[PDB]
């Protein structure tokens, strides 16, 4: 996150850190046993860390839980990054409190212009307030690289953006998870806002997958 601000401690209770020795991606808690992240964040062994603020200090509110099952979207493309979404089932249910809570899945796709909150460690959790951009502008910034399963969030003038270390993290608008940090050319560069997985196109896949596992 560039041009952002340090989040108020525990103000983003659904934020998680994916760790396989060190922090490498973010994620969001959607229920007491499942986390959603980016498919390019796949690793055979992943430990999920919840209730974190400072990733380098044991604060006392953290919960460490190993991933039991890791399921990437069946249509994920490693080259185009289309369908960059993945579900992680935890080894055991986590304890929900003020520091560890779930985020709601979208009721519908949020329209362009909607203000959202992006968070990640890309060592204190960083926050960024930014709007969903019109698909036309997203496409104009990334000629022929944007699919219907992607949405741009940020500013066309750059300056503020998510960056390496934020992948898989949440983009929450009006209390609902609308995006997942995915990719972009550089960070906070003019005419290249961040690109995110459009979560509203996957609600049924998410729910059906959770019900079958």
């Amino acid at each position: 996150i560039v041009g952002g601000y340090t989040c108020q401690e525990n103000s983003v209770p659904y934020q998680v850190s994916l760790n396989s020795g060190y922090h490498f991606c973010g994620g969001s808690l959607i229920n007491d046993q499942w986390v959603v992240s980016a498919a390019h964040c796949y690793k055979s062994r992943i430990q999920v860390r919840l209730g974190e603020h400072n990733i380098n200090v044991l604060e006392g509110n953290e919960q460490f839980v190993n991933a039991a099952k890791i399921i990437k979207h069946p249509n994920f493309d490693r080259k185009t990054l289309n369908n960059d979404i993945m579900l992680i089932k935890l080894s055991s249910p986590v304890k929900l409190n003020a520091r560890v809570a779930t985020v709601a899945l979208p009721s519908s796709c949020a329209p362009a212009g909607t203000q959202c909150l992006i968070s990640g460690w890309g060592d204190l959790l960083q926050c960024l307030d930014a709007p969903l951009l019109p698909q036309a502008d997203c496409e104009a910034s990334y000629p022929g690289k944007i699919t219907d399963n992607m949405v741009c969030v940020g500013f066309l003038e750059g300056g503020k953006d998510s960056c390496q270390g934020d992948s898989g993290g949440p983009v929450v608008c009006n209390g609902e998870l609308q995006g997942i940090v995915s990719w972009g050319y550089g960070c906070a560069l003019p005419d290249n806002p961040g690109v995110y997985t459009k979560v509203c196109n996957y609600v049924d896949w998410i729910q059906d997958t959770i019900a079958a596992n």
């Binding site: 964040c41 490693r78 080259k79 890309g122 960056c163 992948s167 940090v181 995915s182 990719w183 050319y185």
Partner: protein
């Protein structure tokens, strides 16, 4: 040595933070850099040994 060994490390468009190794010709050894998680170029190794074996 191979030409890809002289190219600067490529983070890529993805935003993960994955530590990888690359051959730094200017220094003559393999160092670490942050790989984004997708579209890796050839001067990108999971270990120092493989990096030095290929680009040494």
């Amino acid at each position: 040595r191979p030409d890809f060994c002289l190219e600067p490390p490529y983070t890529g468009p993805c935003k993960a933070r994955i530590i990888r190794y690359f051959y730094n010709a200017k220094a003559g050894l393999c160092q670490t850099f942050v790989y984004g998680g997708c579209r890796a170029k050839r001067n990108n190794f999971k270990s120092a040994e493989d990096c030095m074996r290929t680009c040494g």
